[PDB]
Ligand binder design. Structure first.
Ligand SMILES: Cn1ncc(C(=O)NCc2cocn2)c1C(=O)Nc1ccn2cc(-c3ccccc3)nc2n1
Ligand SMILES: [Mg+2]
Ligand SMILES: [Zn+2]
Length: 311
């Protein structure tokens, strides 16, 4: 019992810039298709996988950007990295990473770690750093322990502990505050030539950068997809900005809808300070991911065109 996709999706799903489409009822099948080719038809009991996916879906909320569509989109980018780097990854890693990507923003509310801390949200007392990401990992373990939801139950005890450790580090790594130092370290290790993928602490860092790259992959799509998704991410930013103003705090300009006019220039900074560096170091470490760097640079050039009034 293979999942099969229509011809256009069967071909395009293999490309980094694939968009999973507006038909929500096809996303679970798209995810299972990706597991079956990335991992095998044996990796998970279908009965259990199908029941884990629908529970994960139910625990994503109807926010403009940090939604179920984002979860599946970030898993597809991971699928494309793993398929283009066949022999670099263990079987456990292939299992753990697609599930980590699907779960990485579980129960997100559309608000940053900073807003939780200024609101004095209970989650900010339970987890002093990576507040939302520790919550996402907590929600992932909860769903795994629902009767009939243990997709890993047929792993050995220690293989089980290793896969939950991969998922945990992978989801904490999607805290962008940690990405800056993670990428500097990987930069120095690759340039001085000390990078060693048989060193666990090095693999961990490489997997963390892959998680940042999949997470940000909305900047790697065709320009029409990237530009329409930018509206979703700004609708969350500006809602958070409005909530900052209700706590009596001027938000950062990213979050102030009154400074919308300056979005193009704020996207440039973001591509230059975060996205380009991310995909460059990733392309240095895993050369076949170069199409993500090339699509990101194409989108930087479309924002330069917006600023020159040519759109
Ligand atoms: C975290 N994170 N994750 C994803 C994205 C994102 O912006 N991804 C880009 C994207 C997602 O989907 C389609 N495109 C970001 C991010 O911090 N962006 C940013 C970062 C800095 N800024 C500054 C401004 C801005 C806007 C208006 C006026 C003045 C300044 N604007 C920004 N925006
Ligand atoms: Mg997140
Ligand atoms: Zn995310």
């Amino acid at each position: 019992m293979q999942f099969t996709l229509p011809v256009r999706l069967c071909k395009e799903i293999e490309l980094f810039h694939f968009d999973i489409g507006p038909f929500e009822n096809m996303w679970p099948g798209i995810f299972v298709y990706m597991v079956h080719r990335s991992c095998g038809t044996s990796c998970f009991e279908l009965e259990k996988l199908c029941r884990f996916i629908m529970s994960v879906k139910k625990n994503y909320r109807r926010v403009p950007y940090h939604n179920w569509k984002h979860a599946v989109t970030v898993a597809h980018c991971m699928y494309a990295i793993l398929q283009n780097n066949h022999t670099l990854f263990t079987d456990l890693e292939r299992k753990g990473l697609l599930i980590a990507c699907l779960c990485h923003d579980l129960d997100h509310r559309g608000f940053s770690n900073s807003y939780l801390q200024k609101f004095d949200h209970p989650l900010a007392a339970l987890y002093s750093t990576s507040t939302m990401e520790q919550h996402h990992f907590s929600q992932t373990v909860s769903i795994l322990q629902l009767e009939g939801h243990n997709i890993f139950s047929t792993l050995s005890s220690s293989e089980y502990e290793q896969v939950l450790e991969i998922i945990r580090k992978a989801i904490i790594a999607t805290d962008l505050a940690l990405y800056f130092g993670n990428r500097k370290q990987l930069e120095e290790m690759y340039q001085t030539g000390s990078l060693n993928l048989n060193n666990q602490s090095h693999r961990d860092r490489v997997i963390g950068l892959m998680m940042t790259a999949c997470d940000l992959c909305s900047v790697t799509k065709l320009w029409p997809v990237t530009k329409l998704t930018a509206n979703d991410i700004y609708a969350e930013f500006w809602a958070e900005g409005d909530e900052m103003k209700k706590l009596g705090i001027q938000p950062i300009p990213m979050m102030d809808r009154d400074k919308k006019d300056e979005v193009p220039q704020g996207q440039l900074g973001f591509y230059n300070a975060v996205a380009i560096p991310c995909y460059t170091t990733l392309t240095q470490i895993l050369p076949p991911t170069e199409p993500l760097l090339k699509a990101c640079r194409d989108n930087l050039s479309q924002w330069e065109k917006v600023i020159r009034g040519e759109e």
